[PDB]
Structure formats: structure tokens, C-alpha cells
């Protein structure tokens, strides 16, 4: 339990360090606003899952959406 | 774009390859059943976040929980 919790922390911190900078760049090429962010996310979800759905892709979309939310906060 | 959906698939498929086998190993060392999955998850969750919380840890917990549910379903 406590040991697996720490291993999840290592995986979690690993996910952060690997892809967080990749999301920032994906948001720059996007240039989203407070009026296209929801439709962009919804269309991106359909486009992603059309080629297949797995837990990694769901987890990638959730992290991207959270980073999308932060980007629209900071540059809106 | 629909162009971004294709790059998320690459990240998503990479996330699956990178950690799915590690999630399997952590689960078969933990050996959970239906009678104990909920308490194990909720204690694993709090202990994880009391060391710090960021979006990677949140999604790692979500993916772990999904594979946890799959392990108990056997």
C-alpha cells in the first residue's frame, strides 16, 4: 500500500517531466481562446478516439485538457 | 485541429507502453480482490497526494485505478 503509493508518485512525477513541455508546445500551435476551447477539446476528443481508445490516450487527453484550461486562464 | 488528436494518440500510446507493465507488477505484488480494492485505492490515493500533487500523479492514479478495477475483475 504505502510502497505502491510511492511507486505511483515516481510514475506520476515521471509523466510530468516527460510530456508537460510537449503539451505547452501543442497549445502554442493551437492558439485557443475562451470561445473555442470547449469545441477544440470536444473535437480533439472525437479525433483522438476515432483512431482508438485506451487508458493512456484517455490519460493524455485529461492532462492536455487540464493544460488547455490553464493556458486559457493565463492568456485570456 | 484534428491534427492535435493524432499527436495525443502518440503520447497516449507511449504512456500505455511505458507504464502499463509497471502497473501490472505493482498490482500482482499487491494482490487485490473486490472485498479490499476500495480501501487499498483510497489509502494509496491519500498517501500519494500527501507527498505532493501534480497532474501527472492525478492521471497516474486514474490509470492505476482503472488497471486496479481490471485486476479485481480478473
Nearest Cα neighbor of B37 from B67, B68, B62 is: B68
Residue A12 DSSP class = H
**Calpha distance B47→B62 (Å, rounded):** 15
Tell me if A53 sits within 8 A of B9, measured CB to CB: no
Experimental resolution (Å): 2.3
CB contact under 8 A, B4 and A26: yes
For B2, the closest of A5, A47, A57 (CB atoms) is: A47
Residue position matching grid coordinates 493556458: A71
Resolved by: X-ray
Dihedral, CA atoms, B3, B9, B10, B11, nearest 10 degrees?
110
Tell me if A8 sits within 8 A of B60, measured CB to CB: yes
Q: Which residue of A has its CA nearest to B58?
A: A12
Nearest Cα neighbor of A26 from A53, A76, A60, A55 is: A60
Cα B70 from chain centre: 11
Q: Where are the domains of chain B?
A: 2-73
Angle (deg, nearest 10), helices B3-30 and B55-73: 60
For B26, the closest of A7, A13, A30 (CB atoms) is: A7
Domain at A1-75: CATH code = 1.10.437.10
Tell me if A3 sits within 8 A of B40, measured CB to CB: no
Query: Following DSSP, what letter does each residue of A32-61 receive, concatenated?
Result: --TTTHHHHHHHHHHHHHHT---HHHHHHH
Fold type of domain B2-73: Apoptosis Regulator Bcl-x (1.10.437)
Amino acid at each position: 500500500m504505502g510502497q505502491v503509493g510511492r511507486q505511483l508518485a515516481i510514475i506520476g512525477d515521471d509523466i510530468n517531466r516527460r510530456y508537460d513541455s510537449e503539451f505547452q508546445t501543442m497549445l502554442q500551435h493551437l492558439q485557443p481562446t475562451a470561445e473555442n476551447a470547449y469545441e477544440y477539446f470536444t473535437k480533439i476528443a472525437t479525433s483522438l478516439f476515432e483512431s482508438g481508445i485506451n487508458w493512456g490516450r484517455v490519460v493524455a487527453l485529461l492532462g492536455f485538457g487540464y493544460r488547455l484550461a490553464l493556458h486559457v486562464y493565463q492568456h485570456g
